[PDB]
Amino acid sequence: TYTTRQIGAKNTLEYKVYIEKDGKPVSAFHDIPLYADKENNIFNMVVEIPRWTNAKLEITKEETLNPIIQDTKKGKLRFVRNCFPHHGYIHNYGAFPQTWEDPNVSHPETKAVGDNDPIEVLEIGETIAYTGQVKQVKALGIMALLDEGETDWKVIAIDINDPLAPKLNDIEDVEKYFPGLLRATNEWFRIYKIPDGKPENQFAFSGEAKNKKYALDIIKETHDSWKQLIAGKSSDSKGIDLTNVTLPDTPTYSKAASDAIPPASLKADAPIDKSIDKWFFI
Amino acid sequence: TYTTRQIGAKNTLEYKVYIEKDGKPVSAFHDIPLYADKENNIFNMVVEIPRWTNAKLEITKEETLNPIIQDTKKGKLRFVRNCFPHHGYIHNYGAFPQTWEDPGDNDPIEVLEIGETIAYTGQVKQVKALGIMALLDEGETDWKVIAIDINDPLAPKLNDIEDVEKYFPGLLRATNEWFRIYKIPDGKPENQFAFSGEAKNKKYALDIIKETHDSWKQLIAGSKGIDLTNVTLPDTPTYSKAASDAIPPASLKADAPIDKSIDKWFFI
Ligand SMILES: [Mg+2]
Ligand SMILES: [Mg+2]
Ligand SMILES: [Mg+2]
Ligand SMILES: [Mg+2]
Ligand SMILES: [Mg+2]
């Protein structure tokens, strides 16, 4: 059973969330199986950012066992800004573990190198998720985002426990049950860093949401990149911490790395600066 | 100085917020002057509902000193549902005190405050009026004043309704949409606007505000089941300073959980 171990107060520099199995930390990047049910293409999603929140919480590639920590921009806590008509992130946002957008090769669909992170996941179900949650999802489709010119695919997915899950099997079903969501998703990922002073992003395929079959193919590619990475065989692993506690055939296997993690020290959420309330009209 | 006194846990039937002046409860309907600066048309707004929340909190006309409580229907706490692409209420939402739509919807006139900062329930902030829309909900006229906190960084650039279009492009469209559809998930019909949903200008809004203030002047001087107790207007029949002292002390209870169903995004 997966649980979380929180260090510190949310919305601070000291905040960390480790994922635990049997009450002991494992790598959120490496040790959670991509597949909950391989035969039925049910995936484990690691949730990073709940819907309608701002704090840019992410799996930290360079820290041992890859806890979720808030990103910083020049030393300051990063919060994604509200871009009208949206409030923070408009999906439960996270990643598939055991995947990598390989930065060392140009990807043919986008003609761009990978962004060096796990493939990311937009989970569209009704219940708001929590940071460090491992939930089980079905893939519905995928969008080819170029995030500051880097390949940054976004998988469209739904929690298998969602009341609608049985009715959502491919990307066209998203438009049927969530009309406007995919178009809003396109806008969101285009504009969300404009308030940070960054350019608009762009999508390949004029932002088309490719179907499930397409999505599975790309998820496979990223899993395969990760398999090379974790084996120590990437041409450049970018100083990623490859320490893991469940993959005995890898050079960086270490069951003991788990014991070295501090105990939970959960504190109440710290206040967020009122600037983060601001609604930007772009 | 205005503060708040909270009784109970948020998101419960027991929750009440009173406004305090220098530590003493006063009526949120009657004791807060409509005008912070009459000469320059600066109004006091009583905030009921923060932007991006769901709990339908309102000044209750029928309880002494008119605390803000959660609305209910047949015993059940009311939460406005999330209507895509909106998250809860899209404005800081509240009322002008010392106003009354004499039936006409029987309530103070409501205020959509459009500034950047999210407000708090029971906050008395100072705003300038920019415009007004006339919502029709169940045969009742339901005026909504568009306003901005005078402390907002943009307040000096916003003086009339056309400035909302320039600095907040799409907000007026979203407002029209929101108030049309927000009760469809509850099983209620779509609402409609007068004037084909046009936001009338500041002048038109000031005329409505003054009118509803004149009505309330009649009300408080002595009424469909409204408690008129006040603690700051000594020559009113219902003046009673002891009312302030009869209010329980603050509870410091943490917010109660809200049922997960309220998370749901409706596509309507
Ligand atoms: Mg980044
Ligand atoms: Mg990046
Ligand atoms: Mg990415
Ligand atoms: Mg009502
Ligand atoms: Mg009304």
From Swiss-Prot, chain B:
Cofactor: Mg(2+)
Residues where Phosphothreonine is found: 64, 236
Record Pfam families: Pyrophosphatase
EC number, UniProt record: 3.6.1.1
A molecular-function term among this protein's GO annotations: inorganic diphosphate phosphatase activity
Principal location listed in the UniProt entry: cytoplasm
Catalytic reaction equation(s): diphosphate + H2O = 2 phosphate + H(+)
Keyword hit for Oxidoreductase: no
Anything else known: Present with 68400 molecules/cell in log phase SD medium.
Name of this chain's protein: Inorganic pyrophosphatase
Organism: Saccharomyces cerevisiae (strain ATCC 204508 / S288c) (Baker's yeast)
